[PDB]
Amino acid sequence: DNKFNKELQNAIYEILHLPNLNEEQRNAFFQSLKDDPSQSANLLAEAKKLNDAQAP
Amino acid sequence: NKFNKEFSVAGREIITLPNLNDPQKKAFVMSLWDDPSQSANLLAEAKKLNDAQAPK
């Protein structure tokens, strides 16, 4: 099934857009995605929770 | 240092090309993700495409 690649591309693309991450946080999410791409939906939700809590 | 800097910088430059559409931005970002050493060629290609899709 395509859910795996589809979910991985979504996580990479959205984390790239999250405005309230810093570069070290963004790159840490990117490296986790490379290390375990099966976790991409959870990593996206971590990144988005984190991005929302860091909003101005 | 940063094992993801070349992807992160080029990906940020891809998505800000205002005349590319969403499927195009997504395809260059996934090419960079898989092949960050091609970042300068992929950016050149993305920029060429962007300016060919401007109204002028």
Numbering used by the authors:
A (entry chain A): 2 to 57
B (entry chain B): 3 to 58
What did the original publication write about this model?
We adopted the Z domain of staphylococcal protein A and its affibody binder dimer complex as a model system. We next generated libraries at the interface of a weakly associating dimer (Z+ ZSPA-1) with micromolar affinity to determine if we could affinity-mature the interface by coevolution. To clarify these inter-residue co-variations discovered from the sequence data, we determined crystal structures of 10 coevolved pairs that spanned a range of cross-reactivities and orthogonalities (5 from LL1 and 5 from LL2). From the structures, we could verify clear compensatory changes between the residues showing the most significant covariations (13A-9B / 17A-31B) in both LL1 and LL2 library mutants.
